[PDB]
Structure 1
Amino acid sequence: LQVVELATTIPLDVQEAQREVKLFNKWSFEDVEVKDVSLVDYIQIRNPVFVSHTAGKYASKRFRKAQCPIVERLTNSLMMNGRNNGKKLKAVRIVKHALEIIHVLTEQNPIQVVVDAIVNSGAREDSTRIGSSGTVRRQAVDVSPLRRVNQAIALLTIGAREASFRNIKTIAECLAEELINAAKGSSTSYAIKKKDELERVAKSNR
């Protein structure tokens, strides 16, 4: 708690990071828990990070993606549609602003809302196709926890992307509305219509 005097002065807020590592020095991982037993091992929130930008090697082995921080997996999916590939700093800026908007709204922990939106967005049964060389055939199969998690991130960012297209509303606050709505399970949000529509068709194939 003591303030440490250096020759190069260090700001007060960053010296507070010595006590705890927090996302953007604002959000704590301590009070965050996954409200689903089946996705605990594939939503990685145990290792805190300061900024959702680690430049790690998560594409080498098969399940290394489960070790990437969940916010970094979310900011990775934002930079899509060609003109945004490789623009991670822009993606981190969007996530950083989105969390603040998620904080002033509903007052919850922003990264808790992120975790809630991910457990509620992954379809639990998807109808794979079993077409015999061209003919249309569908069979209902279960969805693995890893694909369940990473389809939630794919659907959450796709919905936020399309809501901000040709709209005065900015992407950071389109993502905040998309994440908040999916966290509370509202069917108004995209990626909850899709999740319901996936599990609805799967019910008509088993």
Structure 2
Amino acid sequence: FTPVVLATPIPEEVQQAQTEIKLFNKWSFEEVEVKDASLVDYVQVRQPIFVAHTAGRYANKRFRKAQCPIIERLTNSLMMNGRNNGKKLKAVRIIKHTLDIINVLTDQNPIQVVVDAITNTGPREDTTRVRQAVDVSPLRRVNQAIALLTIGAREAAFRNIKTIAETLAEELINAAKGSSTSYAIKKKDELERVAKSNR
């Protein structure tokens, strides 16, 4: 299918980006849909990116943070514990390895898997210290979902054999499938439990 070649010898696996439907270096990007209808316009798949390193100004304004690619948002949220401040190359390599593990296990378009996981672990209701049950906006839902997922992956990869990428993969898989065996879902239902007791 149009195997064009260049004077610089490079594999055609990189030229295969735009010859057909645009997609990641490895993963299709068009077949992503949020399973809910509320968190739309805050997950920013499509626009697609070639790698989760879009170093763009996303903090000058209030709501520009929402249009950042969600893969880069999770890559950024991996950049914690102080020691791993910075090291965006490390974070994006971890994200690549995690997408690969989600591909190996019930692939389901791993970027779509993480989208579904974030939507399923975004807390729909919280409590404010007045303790009154208030609602949660989609932006807070997305940021809290990403924070819970990365924190669970962080404290699962902490002091154990399995690497950060696979702890992240198993956390995101359990959040996408909506099982209460993982940290993000457990803490989301913990936050949602005090909704009838705080009204």
Q: Is the 8 A contact 2:101 2:166 kept in 1?
A: yes
| Match status 1:198 vs 2:179 | no
| Match status 1:32 vs 2:25 | no
Give me the whole-angstrom Cα distance separating, in 1, the residues matched to 2:46 and 2:22. 11
What does residue range 103-114 of structure 1 map to in structure 2 within 5 Å?
A: 103-114=103-114
Summarize deviations over 1:29-79 as a string: whole Å, max 9, x none.
Answer: 111101111111101012110100011000011000111001000000001
Give me the whole-angstrom Cα distance separating, in 1, the residues matched to 2:6 and 2:45. 32
Between the two proteins, what is the percent identity of the paired residues?
A: 82
Give me the whole-angstrom Cα distance separating, in 2, the residues matched to 1:205 and 1:90. 42
What does residue range 7-156 of structure 1 map to in structure 2 within 5 Å?
A: 7-19=7-19, 20-23=21-24, 25-130=25-130, 138-156=131-149
Task: State which of 157, 171, 175 in structure 2 corresponds to 1:178.
Answer: 171
| Match status 1:167 vs 2:160 | yes
Residue 111 of structure 1 aligns to which amino acid in structure 2?
I
Q: Quote how far apart the aligned CAs of 1:107 are.
A: 2.7
Name which one, 1 or 2, has greater alpha-carbon Rg: 1
Query: Gaps (5+ residues) in structure 1?
Result: 131-137
Q: Is the 8 A contact 2:23 2:30 kept in 1?
A: no
Q: Is the 8 A contact 1:21 1:50 kept in 2?
A: no
Give me the whole-angstrom Cα distance separating, in 2, the residues matched to 1:203 and 1:144. 19
Give me the whole-angstrom Cα distance separating, in 2, the residues matched to 1:60 and 1:100. 33
Please, what TM-score do these two structures have when normalized by structure 2? Answer: 0.97
Give me the whole-angstrom Cα distance separating, in 1, the residues matched to 2:86 and 2:70. 19
Q: Quote how far apart the aligned CAs of 1:191 are.
A: 1.1
Residue 87 of structure 1 aligns to which amino acid in structure 2?
K
Q: Quote how far apart the aligned CAs of 1:2 are.
A: 1.2
Per the alignment, residue 134 of structure 1 pairs with none
Give me the whole-angstrom Cα distance separating, in 1, the residues matched to 2:45 and 2:109. 13
Please, what TM-score do these two structures have when normalized by structure 1? Answer: 0.94
Residue 107 of structure 2 aligns to which amino acid in structure 1?
E
Paired residue secondary structure (1:117): helix
Q: Quote how far apart the aligned CAs of 1:21 are.
A: 3.4
Give me the CA root mean square deviation.
0.9
Residue 195 of structure 1 aligns to which amino acid in structure 2?
K
Query: Gaps (5+ residues) in structure 2?
Result: none
Q: Quote how far apart the aligned CAs of 1:103 are.
A: 0.8
How many residues were matched structurally?
Answer: 198
Residue 134 of structure 2 aligns to which amino acid in structure 1?
V
Give me the whole-angstrom Cα distance separating, in 2, the residues matched to 1:22 and 1:151. 28
Q: Quote how far apart the aligned CAs of 1:11 are.
A: 1.0
Give me the whole-angstrom Cα distance separating, in 1, the residues matched to 2:11 and 2:18. 12
